[PDB]
Design a protein around this ligand. Structure first.
Ligand SMILES: *[C@@](C)(CO)[C@](*)(O)[C@H](CC(C)C)NC(=O)[C@H](Cc1ccccc1)NC(=O)[C@H](CC(C)C)NC(=O)[C@H](CCc1ccccc1)NC(=O)CN1CCOCC1
Ligand SMILES: *[C@@](C)(CO)[C@](*)(O)[C@H](CC(C)C)NC(=O)[C@H](Cc1ccccc1)NC(=O)[C@H](CC(C)C)NC(=O)[C@H](CCc1ccccc1)NC(=O)CN1CCOCC1
Ligand SMILES: *[C@@](C)(CO)[C@](*)(O)[C@H](CC(C)C)NC(=O)[C@H](Cc1ccccc1)NC(=O)[C@H](CC(C)C)NC(=O)[C@H](CCc1ccccc1)NC(=O)CN1CCOCC1
Ligand SMILES: [Cl-]
Ligand SMILES: [Mg+2]
Ligand SMILES: [Mg+2]
Ligand SMILES: [Mg+2]
Lengths: 195, 222, 222, 233, 125, 196, 204, 212, 195
């Protein structure tokens, strides 16, 4: 767990998440998917403390899927992000808090708009055009401040994302073994296999 | 601040033969540089041809033995007086020890007896319950002195056949009860010479199909 | 360690056990704790083994040079003064606990020195881990106007109390008698009440048991 | 988690041919202050057991109440309370040993070292030790605190092993105990001259001696000792 | 807490409360299940004494427990919601721990187990 | 320790117990805490045995060298040398010293030097762990210009109580009498003073 | 961060009938990592043999130091240093660094060329001499070696028998210690011949 | 400890050492670090001996209860998740466990799951766990191919443990081999490093650092 | 400073040293040469505490160069390694020790043999067929135990070295930006430009 990025463009949300899983002086895995599909048009990437991350992600996934079955209806990305925030807001004052930071990328079908939410382990939620957790932000935010435009296409967003990954691969101390990129739009969620 | 643990010293030793098994232990009980007792037995007959010793912190050792003895009693009540096999006893002891995983019994436990095929068996436990059957095991203060000697003399480690260019190992064989008791006595006299917490007396419990026999020997009292 | 000193009619006697420890391990079973400062001034040492040896040799060396300079036999108070001032200067970091005794032109003397540089005078004294065991015996059996043979008995009894009851002390009893008008007699291994019993078995291996990879002659000559 | 406040020092004891002897001084120290001087630290239970207690005095008084209550509880619905079903030393000890270990296991110990001395119904001598940690052991001689370091060596010269017990009389055994108490008065900074001594014999029963004093002390040689090395005056 | 044993045996060896619960099922609207070679069909009756209904929002008789399992019923409508909810939760719990959706037999066994628990628990019918 | 020094009509008397401790163990039960730095200038030692001995040895050396050049030093001079050592090495010393001496001009004088290294001239002085228990008693019972026998009784009764209550004090009661007549050593054993 | 058990290693010495033996393992590691299996811990200056366990940099430094001092000794004295004298030199040198010591457990072994007497000795890190008739042990498996030697040893062993005893003492002690092993060397020392044997042991 | 298990053409190889340490004290050379859960499931153990042993022995009981209740052998995924969910409950309490759940089922095929005491659960083809994992990785990765034969794969797993047993001070004793196929696990013997090292050195010509 | 390796083959010594210089969350440089030429046939690579490494390397280099001028003669690799060890052995008991680990690869012209010495900051010297400092050893030693042969050529040594770098690039957590490889033989020191 280290690098998770998010970029909201005109018609979609793009999430990039690093593939490396390290413990000690060994990279145990280089093909790890740090994300779960909460609903057909909502995707959550995650990063933080070992064990906590997946346990939390799947717990949220289960709750959202339960809601979908009960109401035969998909929750809006805004509604999901508010639910997730509250869970983390409870967590932080628990005996043992979830040390998990997340990005929630979703496509609101009622508004026909992509939405990207950044929530830290304290339960601090913000809607953003582009987001990142951990040390990634220290490079990507300034880069996106410069190159990002609000009316960009998905293809332009992927090129913008390639520019971030290249910078991280150049200046980051740790080898994060590339990223898995996923796109969230009106047609749902799909994975870019060649990045 | 109150420290709930203490070190009562002493050392124990288990060796398994073909149709017997011994569990020996010195009778000295200590705290710091003082002798509490020159004869305080810590090797106990627990019934069903099982002998047990829990060396380390005596209070925890006595508690454990007391609880296992009680476990044997209730095993008879609940299962129609069935004999508790040595392998079943060992697993039961694991659960006693691990039950206090987060406030452990500070003891090295060894039990000895006969397996269900009538062959000699020795099991050893760490403080939190990991166990293993072995032909040979020393535990306690002077375990580090005695154990490598047992490897050499019981399991014939590092011993090769003369004139075979270190190619053929010395063949493993069971030892007689007479030969085992020699190794026990020599192990404890050696440990007494070089370890201050070991001495006073040696008590050996021998387990055969006939029952549990005892033997006592003097050790140096300095 | 256990060390003692006892005054008598026409002189003074000191004694010591012969155990040397390294944690709970007995490193030396027969080390000499009675040190010669000058021919008729001897010193029993407890505490850090290197320090007691080093500090006694240094002062012993300077006492010899002083004796040659002054053309006089050295005095116990000179050794006492030089030791305490040296030990005090190092603020207890030199862990030497000494019983200093001897005879000189002034008479017979018995002192103790502690690591921090404090000195005490007495007719009977004891230092070391087994000083309480020894002092119990001294307090029970000491009297004024002891003879030579009575003082040796009392001293060795006080050491024995340490040997048996203190885990820090053991093995043998060394004694040194310093009588006025006579040569001091150093009785190395005066008592040996801790002889190792015959081993049950000989562990002499058959020749060729150990596997060898290489052989070579080593050149020690020029 | 505790710290002891008002404390009692050494309790010493030994076996002899027909029974057991136990002793302890009458002091209740408050750190270096020798605060209380009328404290009885030997507590008889029935006519066949004496419990000697060292360490924290508040916890000692709690144990007194438990033993007092134990006698009461044993008498309930028990026609043989003063005969076959009377309290044995082994019963009293095991009870205390159970409590001591349960309390250490709850990280709230009774800050004591206890020696239960007595004679069983079959005439056998009982002498066993237990402390704040729940640690138990038995020996021909037992002692707590400074007693362990100074008394035991002296008492072991009389009874060094099991076979020496029949050879030791009550006269010899008491003499060794009284001597040990003197040595402790010389050398233990939290001890007093006044003490109590108890003898539990299988024939003559329980003899409880109060208001004893250490006597026949050697102090005269002090006048000859001058300075700390050189000084002649 | 209310402890009363409501479901109990009678002299003839019957639990009347369980049998009277079956009468409530017999009162309920008809439901039918027919399974073919490659499909299952769940048919359900809806009584026509209720006109001026809003069929968009009225609770449907067939309920999805998961994306692959469905549950229809006959009897008390309010009671059925409790079983459906429990079944839906268990369906998600099974996916979470076993990493695989429930079998139809498993889901049935769970629902049936809930129904049984209410036949020998105190305070409940 | 329990120590004290008391001036009286004919001169001054120093008093002390004889106990030395390591924790609760009594390392020496017949200690001599009254020590000579000059013919008729003595001191009572409390605190670290090593420090007080090292100090007293140095003071004795200084006063011996003083006597060789300038003749007999005053009791004030001796107290000044003690102070100089205790004050300048206050960070590395644990020594509570009472200086007492007899001049023919100044008669009996008592100076006390606590941990800090300050000097205090007094009619009488008490110090050491066991002194705390006898402030009340000594204040109520002390009188100036007492006789020798009265001063001996005052010290004996005082130290008896200090010993009785303080675990760190005990053994024999040593005393040293400083007058024009000379130097007299006195000793008093438990059997006498305990039952006062 | 315990200097004496970073690199690991063991040395053992024994006396026999008109002979002495000194033996050591070959491991040098950095805690868990084994680095070298050729690191010998026994050196010799003339006929006097010195084994050194502990911190490897100090083992190397002290060897170079005692080579230095024995070379000057020989030039001035016009004779080789004897084991009894060398023992005193080691003690002096170690105690010179009393409050900043070399983290080592040295072991002297040899035969006095004048008297013909077998001699062995051991030291703590600050130079306290531990003389012995029977045997001296040192290193991370000292407890193990003490136990092996105390049981296996007997007096007046012949050189060929003494070799088997010391070799079995070292091997079985080393196998119960994680930081010791990886090979072993045994020196058999007679009055005027010295045989050096490399032992075959398990390489884990 | 050193333990590994890798996936390949012919199923799964699992290899472990047998050493147990208490600090620098070598406590045992004959510990069984492969737990036989059932004829189709294996579990490797590394870390705290009691924690691993107790809980993987407990895991086998939970897997038995599954097949009684469900009339079907538990999946490798479900088995590993029972253990990972268990240790996650004890997170922060100080459990020390590095385990690998290896096995075959019809729906999954050959599968390996890494599970540790801080709650990490990872599916993968190759894993090495323990104090000597890096030493095993070095040999295993540099010689690994998917198209290895059963004979070559067994040897590589054995050789990788040997490599770690040699260099890692806290690994050794003997190598325990296992091979997991569609028909279940097959034991391939206990191999003492005492004899295996010299046998491998001579035949392979490797270990030139050591004095031959 | 992190990865330094060394492999002695039949006729040469090969040193590989990582190019990355990291501080904090930034790779400041990716072309750093962590080595100094002590003499024409002796090369020392180094790794450890920032500042100390280069300061120590150049100090040694100066001393060896001074010796060469004074005697008009090149010191043997053994002699140089002994000098370096003594300097570190002094250092460790100084007020502030040099926290520097080094490898000394050299070709002895008198013996016609390559020599590789591994010396840590404590002054612990060992001659080896292959060596490494830091976490590198935990992967490379076991790998070389398997694949290394004493009679290998320089080309075989470079392939063996490529095998080490590949393993490190696969399993090491940090990105060390490849290695600079240098060969020391009878003809002196030269750098492999394409690795
Ligand atoms: C009785 C026997 C006390 O038990 C006596 O008081 C004797 C005194 C006699 C021998 C003169 N005391 C000892 O034997 C003494 C006990 C001791 C131990 C440690 C500190 C103080 C006192 N033992 C020693 O001094 C041994 C002598 C050996 C056996 C030859 N030395 C050690 O135990 C040294 C301690 C050195 C030391 C350094 C700095 C301050 C104080 C002491 N310890 C070691 O060598 C342990 N370790 C071995 C591996 O290398 C790292 C150090
Ligand atoms: C009364 C008793 C208290 O004020 C008197 O003042 C006497 C004065 C006489 C002796 C001149 N004081 C003491 O007896 C004095 C009390 C004391 C203790 C510690 C610091 C200051 C004062 N006792 C001592 O000085 C003893 C004398 C020795 C035993 C002969 N020394 C110790 O107790 C040493 C002192 C170490 C020390 C610490 C700080 C400064 C100087 C010296 N302590 C130990 O050895 C500690 N010991 C280690 C083993 O575990 C038990 C404690
Ligand atoms: C390699 C060998 C090292 O990592 C493996 O990982 C093996 C795994 C095998 C055994 C399954 N691990 C160990 O050998 C493991 C290392 C370890 C030790 C302690 C904590 C975590 C990991 N060793 C143990 O678990 C030993 C096994 C015994 C010796 C058979 N056990 C202990 O060290 C025990 C229990 C430790 C403990 C854990 C949790 C709570 C309390 C205690 N401790 C002791 O026996 C204490 N000690 C032994 C020496 O004598 C004094 C007392
Ligand atoms: Cl004093
Ligand atoms: Mg008093
Ligand atoms: Mg080993
Ligand atoms: Mg190993």
């Amino acid at each position: 767990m280290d690098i998770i990025l998010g970029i909201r463009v005109q018609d979609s949300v793009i999430l990039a998440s690093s593939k490396a899983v390290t413990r000690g002086i060994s990279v145990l895995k280089d093909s790890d998917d740090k994300t779960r599909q909460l609903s057909p048009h909502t995707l959550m990437s995650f990063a933080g403390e070992a064990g906590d991350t997946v346990q939390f992600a799947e717990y949220i996934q289960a709750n959202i899927q339960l809601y979908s079955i009960r109401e035969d209806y998909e929750l809006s990305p805004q509604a999901v992000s508010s639910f997730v925030r509250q869970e983390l807001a409870k967590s932080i004052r628990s005996r043992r808090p979830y040390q998990v930071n997340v990005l929630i990328g979703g496509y609101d079908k009622k508004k026909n708009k992509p939405e990207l939410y950044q929530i830290d382990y304290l339960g601090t939620k913000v809607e953003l055009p582009y987001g990142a957790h951990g040390y990634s932000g220290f490079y990507t935010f300034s880069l996106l401040d410069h190159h990002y435009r609000p009316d960009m296409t998905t293809e332009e967003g992927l090129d913008l994302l390639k520019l971030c990954v290249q910078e991280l691969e150049k200046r980051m101390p740790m080898d994060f073994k590339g990223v898995i990129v996923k796109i969230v739009d009106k047609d749902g969620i799909r994975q870019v296999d060649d990045f | 601040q109150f420290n709930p643990y203490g070190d009562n010293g002493g050392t124990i030793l288990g060796i398994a033969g073909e149709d017997f098994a011994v569990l020996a232990g010195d009778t000295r009980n200590i705290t710091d540089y003082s002798i509490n007792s020159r004869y305080e037995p810590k090797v106990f007959d627990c019934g069903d041809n099982i002998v047990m010793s829990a060396n380390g912190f005596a209070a925890d050792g006595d508690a454990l033995v007391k609880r296992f003895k009680n476990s044997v009693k209730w095993y008879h009540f609940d299962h129609n007086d069935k004999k508790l096999s040595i392998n079943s006893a060992a697993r039961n002891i694991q659960h006693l020890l691990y039950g206090k995983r987060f406030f452990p019994y500070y003891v090295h436990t060894i039990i000895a007896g006969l397996d269900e095929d009538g062959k000699g068996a020795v099991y050893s436990f760490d403080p939190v319950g990991s166990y293993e059957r072995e032909q040979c095991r020393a535990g306690g203060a002077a375990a580090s002195l005695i154990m490598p000697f047992l490897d050499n003399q019981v399991n014939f480690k590092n011993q090769y056949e003369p004139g075979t260019n270190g190619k053929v190992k010395k063949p493993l064989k069971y030892l007689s009860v007479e030969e085992v008791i020699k190794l026990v006595r020599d192990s404890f006299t050696s440990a007494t010479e070089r370890h201050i917490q070991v001495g006073d007396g040696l008590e050996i419990l021998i387990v055969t199909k006939d029952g549990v026999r005892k033997e006592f020997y003097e050790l140096k009292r300095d | 360690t256990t060390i003692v000193g006892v005054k008598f009619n026409n002189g003074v006697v000191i004694a010591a056990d012969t155990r040397s420890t390294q944690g709970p391990i007995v490193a030396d079973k027969n080390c000499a704790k009675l040190h010669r400062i000058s021919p008729k001034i001897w010193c029993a040492g407890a505490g850090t083994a290197a320090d007691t040896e080093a500090v006694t040799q240094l002062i012993g060396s300077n006492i010899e040079l002083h004796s040659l300079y002054t053309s006089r036999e050295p005095r116990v108070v000179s050794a006492l003064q030089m030791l305490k001032q040296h030990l005090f200067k190092y603020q207890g970091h030199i862990g030497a606990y000494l019983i200093v005794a001897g005879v000189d032109p002034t008479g017979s003397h018995l002192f103790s020195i502690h690591a921090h540089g404090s000195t005490d005078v007495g007719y009977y004294l004891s230092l070391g881990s087994g000083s309480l065991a020894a002092m119990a015996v001294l307090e029970s059996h000491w009297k004024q106007d002891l003879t030579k043979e009575e003082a040796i008995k009392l001293a060795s009894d006080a050491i024995q109390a340490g040997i048996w009851n203190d885990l820090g002390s053991g093995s043998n009893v060394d004694v040194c008698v310093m009588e006025i008008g006579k040569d001091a007699e150093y009785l190395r291994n005066y008592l040996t009440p801790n002889v190792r019993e015959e081993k049950q078995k000989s562990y002499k291996f058959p020749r060729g048991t150990t596997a060898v990879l290489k052989e070579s002659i080593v050149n020690i000559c020029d | 988690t505790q710290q002891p406040i008002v404390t009692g020092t050494s309790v010493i004891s030994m076996k002899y041919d027909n029974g057991v002897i136990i002793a302890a001084d009458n002091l209740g120290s408050y750190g270096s202050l020798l605060r209380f001087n009328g404290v009885e630290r030997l507590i008889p239970v029935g006519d066949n057991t004496v419990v000697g207690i060292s360490g924290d005095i508040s916890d000692m008084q709690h144990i007194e109440r438990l033993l007092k209550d134990l006698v009461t509880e044993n008498a309930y619905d028990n026609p043989l309370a003063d005969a076959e079903e009377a309290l044995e030393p082994s019963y009293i000890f095991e009870y205390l040993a159970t409590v001591m270990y349960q309390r250490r296991s709850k990280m709230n110990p009774l800050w004591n070292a206890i020696i239960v001395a007595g004679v069983q119904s079959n005439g056998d001598q009982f002498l066993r030790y237990v402390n704040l940690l729940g640690v138990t052991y038995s020996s021909p001689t037992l002692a707590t605190g400074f007693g362990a370091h100074m008394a035991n060596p002296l008492l072991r010269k009389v009874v060094d092993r099991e076979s020496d017990i029949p050879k030791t009389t009550v006269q010899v055994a008491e003499e060794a105990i009284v001597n040990a108490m003197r040595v402790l008065y010389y050398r233990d900074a939290r001890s007093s001259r006044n003490f109590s001594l108890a003898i539990i014999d299988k024939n003559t029963g329980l003899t409880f001696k109060k208001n004893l004093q250490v006597e026949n002390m050697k102090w005269d040689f002090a006048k000859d000792i001058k300075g700390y090395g050189t000084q002649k005056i | 807490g209310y402890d009363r044993a409501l479901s109990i045996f009678s002299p003839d060896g019957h639990i009347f409360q369980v049998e009277y619960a079956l009468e409530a099922v017999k009162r309920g609207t008809c439901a039918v299940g027919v399974k073919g070679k490659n499909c299952v069909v769940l048919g359900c009756e809806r009584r026509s004494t209720l006109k001026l209904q809003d069929t968009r929002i009225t609770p449907s008789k067939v309920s999805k427990i998961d994306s692959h399992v469905v549950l229809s019923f006959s009897g008390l409508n309010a009671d059925s919601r409790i079983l459906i909810e429990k079944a839906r939760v268990e369906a998600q719990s099974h996916r979470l721990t076993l990493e695989d959706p429930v079998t139809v037999e498993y889901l049935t066994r769970y629902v049936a187990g809930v129904q049984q628990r209410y036949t020998q628990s105190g305070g409940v019918r | 320790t329990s120590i004290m020094a008391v001036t009286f009509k004919d001169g001054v008397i120093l008093g002390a117990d004889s106990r030395t401790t390591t924790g609760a163990y009594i390392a020496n039960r017949v200690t001599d805490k009254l020590t000579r730095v000059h013919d008729k200038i003595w001191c009572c030692r409390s605190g670290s045995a090593a420090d007080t001995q090292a100090i007293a040895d140095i003071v004795q050396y200084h006063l011996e060298l003083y006597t060789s050049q300038y003749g007999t030093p005053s009791t004030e001079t001796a107290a000044s040398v003690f102070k100089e050592l205790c004050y300048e090495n206050k960070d590395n010393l644990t020594a509570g010293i009472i200086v007492a001496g007899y001049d023919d001009k100044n008669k009996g004088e008592v100076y006390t030097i606590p941990l800090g290294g300050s000097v205090h001239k007094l009619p009488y002085a008490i110090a050491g762990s066991g002194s705390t228990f006898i402030y009340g008693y000594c204040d109520k019972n002390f009188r100036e210009n007492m006789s020798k026998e009265e001063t001996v009784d005052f010290i004996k009764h005082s130290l008896s109580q200090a010993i009785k209550w303080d675990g760190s004090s005990g053994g024999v009661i040593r005393m040293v009498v400083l007058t024009a007549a000379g130097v007299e050593r006195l000793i008093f054993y438990p059997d006498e003073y305990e039952q006062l | 961060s315990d200097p004496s058990s970073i690199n690991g290693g063991i040395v053992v010495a024994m006396t026999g009938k008109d002979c002495v033996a000194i033996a050591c393992d070959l491991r040098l590691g950095s805690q868990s990592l084994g680095v070298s299996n050729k690191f010998e811990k026994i050196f010799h200056y003339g006929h006097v043999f010195l084994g050194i366990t502990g911190l490897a940099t100090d083992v190397t430094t002290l060897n170079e130091m005692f080579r230095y001092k024995t070379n000057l000794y020989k030039l001035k004295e016009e004779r080789a240093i004897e084991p009894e004298t060398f023992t005193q030199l080691v003690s002096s040198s170690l105690y010179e660094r009393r409050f900043g010591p070399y983290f080592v457990g040295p072991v002297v072994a040899g035969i006095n060329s004048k008297s013909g007497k077998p001699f062995i000795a051991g030291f703590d890190l600050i130079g306290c001499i531990d003389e012995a008739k029977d045997f001296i042990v040192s290193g991370t498996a000292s407890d193990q070696l003490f136990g092996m030697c105390e049981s296996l040893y007997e007096p007046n062993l012949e050189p060929e028998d003494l070799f088997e005893t010391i070799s079995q003492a070292l091997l079985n002690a080393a196998d119960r210690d994680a930081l010791s092993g990886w090979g072993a060397v045994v020196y058999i020392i007679k009055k005027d011949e010295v045989v050096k044997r490399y032992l075959k042991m398990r390489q884990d | 400890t050193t333990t590994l298990a890798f996936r390949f053409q012919g199923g799964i190889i699992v290899a472990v050492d047998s050493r147990a340490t208490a600090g620098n004290w070598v406590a045992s050379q004959t510990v069984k670090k492969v737990i036989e859960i059932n004829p189709f499931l294996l579990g490797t153990v590394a870390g705290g001996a009691a924690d691993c042993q107790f809980w993987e022995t407990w895991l086998g009981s939970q897997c038995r209860l599954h097949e009684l209740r469900e009339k079907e052998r538990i999946s490798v995924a479900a088995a590993s998740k029972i253990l990972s969910n268990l240790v996650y409950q004890y997170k922060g309490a100080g459990l020390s466990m590095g385990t690998m759940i290896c096995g075959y089922t019809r729906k999954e095929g050959p599968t390996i799951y890494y599970v540790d005491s801080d709650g990490t659960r990872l599916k993968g083809d190759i894993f090495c766990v323990g104090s000597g994992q890096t030493f095993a990785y070095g040999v295993l990765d540099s010689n690994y191919k998917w198209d290895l034969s059963v004979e070559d794969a067994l040897y590589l797993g054995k050789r990788s443990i040997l490599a770690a047993a040699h260099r890692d001070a806290y690994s050794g004793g003997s190598v325990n081999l296992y091979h997991v196929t569609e028909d279940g696990w097959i034991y391939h013997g206990n191999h003492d490093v005492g004899e295996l090292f010299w046998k491998v050195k001579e035949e392979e010509g490797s270990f030139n650092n050591v004095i031959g």
